[PDB]
Amino acid sequence: EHKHSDESTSESFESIADNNDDSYFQRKPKLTEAP
């Protein structure tokens, strides 16, 4: 639950900028729709 016990040192999110976070942590948070 708590304490990541050290691993990625960022869990699964850690906005660093507006060009990086939108590629390493984001990685398309949505699914494939294609209407």
Side-chain angles (χ1 to χ4, degrees):
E1 303 182 276
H2 297 89
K3 189 75 170 62
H4 50 285
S5 184
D6 304 88
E7 185 182 275
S8 300
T9 320
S10 300
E11 295 183 277
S12 293
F13 56 97
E14 183 177 85
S15 300
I16 325 167
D18 191 81
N19 73 149
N20 190 210
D21 68 313
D22 286 272
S23 186
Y24 96 92
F25 119 82
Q26 186 173 269
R27 203 185 178 181
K28 285 285 182 301
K30 65 179 182 179
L31 293 73
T32 59
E33 288 62 84

